[PDB]
UniProtKB/Swiss-Prot annotation:
It is found in: Secreted. Gene3D superfamilies: 1.10.530.10. Belongs to the glycosyl hydrolase 22 family. Residues 1-129 form the C-type lysozyme domain. This is Lysozyme C. Monomer. The lineage of its organism: Eukaryota, Metazoa, Chordata, Craniata, Vertebrata. In the egg white and polymorphonuclear leukocytes. CDD domains: LYZ_C (cd16897). PANTHER family: LYSOZYME C. Disulfide bonds join C6-C127, C30-C115, C64-C80, C76-C94.
């Protein structure tokens, strides 16, 4: 599924991501934009052999099981495939664990480099939320 900007804002708010660990909805939509271009089926291989899955490019290194990431953990207790669903529940549940891990949204390197400190409210501008 390719979400619209306001559609994804709405889904994230419904799943309780808005101001989660103090991160406004704009921050989450911005992170999703640059991680996946709002595509739930986005997958990208990392140089270390791990893979990033879904709207928030969650890494098999730590968070999900893909059966092909040696020495990895599955701290969200899910198959990485569940992070590719048109339903964003698994992605949101696991993103709450990641953002709680101690470095907040810096865990998303595209958030740090492309969203952090920017006018993130622009991402929910004109959405009926
Ligand atoms: Na894993």
């Amino acid at each position: 599924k390719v979400f619209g900007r306001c559609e994804l804002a709405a889904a994230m708010k419904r799943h309780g991501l808005d101001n989660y660990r103090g991160y406004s909805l704009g921050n989450w939509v911005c992170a999703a934009k640059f991680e996946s271009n709002f595509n739930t089926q986005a997958t990208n291989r990392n140089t270390d052999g791990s893979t990033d899955y879904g709207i928030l490019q969650i890494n098999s290194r730590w968070w999900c099981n893909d059966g092909r990431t040696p020495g990895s953990r599955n701290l969200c207790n899910i198959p990485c495939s569940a992070l590719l669903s048109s339903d964003i529940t698994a992605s949101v549940n696991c993103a709450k664990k990641i953002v709680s891990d101690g470095n907040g949204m810096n865990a998303w390197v595209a958030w740090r480099n492309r969203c952090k400190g920017t006018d993130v409210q622009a991402w929910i501008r004109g959405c009926r939320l």
